[model samples]
Target: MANIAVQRIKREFKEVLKSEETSKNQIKVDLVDENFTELRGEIAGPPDTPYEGGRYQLEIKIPETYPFNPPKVRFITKIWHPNISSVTGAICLDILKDQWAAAMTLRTVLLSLQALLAAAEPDDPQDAVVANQYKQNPEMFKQTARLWAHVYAGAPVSSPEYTKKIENLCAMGFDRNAVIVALSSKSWDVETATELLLS
Candidate 1:
């Protein structure tokens, strides 16, 4: 059982290395061990989204079941999105779970993740707060997601207005990240965020 998994992973690794997506700088794969059970994957954030220009890394762990089961994959890069946990980087994509098919390749999985960046499913949320923000206030969601992409994913900095809000809270001795989280979840209402932080 393990042999099949190892053999498939080895072939997939080489396939990813020579893929057009890899050449275009859109997706990448790297071996993490001599046994090929662990791998590192990277995907460029899809264009025209808040995550655009950001590079997101993923951890992929092959199961002994090989093609009979999906690889365990999760973000190593922190991203602000409804279907991706802002705290733990766990992804809520269907394909990564019960929807996985034996025919799906690593390259396809990466592309699907990139596509998820472009289109989020707030209803099937990994982060309830993020989903609420996404549904209740789209503009705020974009700004917040863009800020996260810039700060955590090496994308260009944006939303100085929000940055200033965080800075103001930070000036009062609040942790910068905690301030960002509180402010974002509270719809940038400083008084409410401050109270939330205080409690």
Candidate 2:
């Protein structure tokens, strides 16, 4: 079983390298080990979304089951999105779980994740607070997500107001990430974020 896993991954690895998406700078994959059980993946953020101009890294682990089971995948780049955990980087995509099929390749999985960035599933969210904000305050969500992309994923800078708000909290001796979480959950209310931080 392990042999099959290695062999299939080898084939898929080459295919991914030669893929048009690779040439187009949309997706990328690299080996983490010579044996092929672990890999690093990167996907370009889809255009026109808050994630645009960002590159998200992913960690991929292939099980011994090979094509019969899906590879375990998670975000290595921190992202603020409903279907991805802001703290842990765990993802909530069906293809990575129950909907996984043997036919799906790494290329497809990467593309699906890019699509997920463009169209989130807030109704079945991995982070309830983010989902709530996404559903209740779309403009705020966009600003926050773009801010996160800029801060973590090399995206072009955006939302100076949000950045200033974060700076104010950072000046107050709170951790920057803690402030981001508090502000994101509290709808960017500084008082509420301060209370959350102090508590």
Candidate 3:
């Protein structure tokens, strides 16, 4: 049974390497040992997120049960997110837990991680402070997020005009954090701010 699972996982692992959606020239995956019970993977963050231009490492641990259980995954690199545990790099996604099915393959798992950056599940957050800030005051959340993206993810820095609008909003005694985010979302334009206030 172990041999069968090893053979199957090896074959599927190679397929994941070739998949365009999960495979990138910057990403690589390899078996940890002859038994194929463990694997090491690395991914370069996508171009626009807070994780961009950074290389993140991942671990995949297959159980004796093989496809019957979801592979254990964790980030070997540090990352900050509402749904990912910053301390241990554990991810809070349903597919890794209750949503997992035996039919799912390694390709699906890696693709899911890539897709996670585009959409975060704030309601069910792993980091409460970040999630609350994201939910209670959207503007500040965006600014902080953008800043993190710029610093860690390699996104371009926020523009100056937008920064000025953030200052103006802060002058009104509004949340400075919110102001920054709102300005960014408006593409740092002031006219839209007037329109938003009017509505």
Best by lDDT: 2
Model 2: lowest-lDDT 10 consecutive positions: 1-10
Model 2 bad stretches (over 4 Å) = none
Instruction: Please state every model's RMSD to the true fold in angstroms.
Output: 1.3, 1.0, 8.9
Q: Please, what are the lDDT tens digits per residue for candidate 2 over residues 22-80? A: 99999999999887889999998899999999999999998888899999999999999
What TM-score goes with each of the models? 0.95, 0.97, 0.67
Off by over 4 Å in 1: none
RMSD of 1: 1.3
Clash pairs for candidate 1 = none
Q: In candidate 3, what are the lDDT values of residues 1-199, reduced to their tens digit?
A: 4876777697788887787745455556787787787898766666566566556678888888877778899877655567776557788888888899988878777767766765778988876756776677666565655554554444565645456666777787767645544554444556675455445
lDDT of 1: 0.90
- lDDT of each candidate versus the true structure: 0.90, 0.92, 0.68
Candidate 2 lDDT (Cα, 0 to 1): 0.92
- Between candidates 2 and 3, the TM-score winner: 2
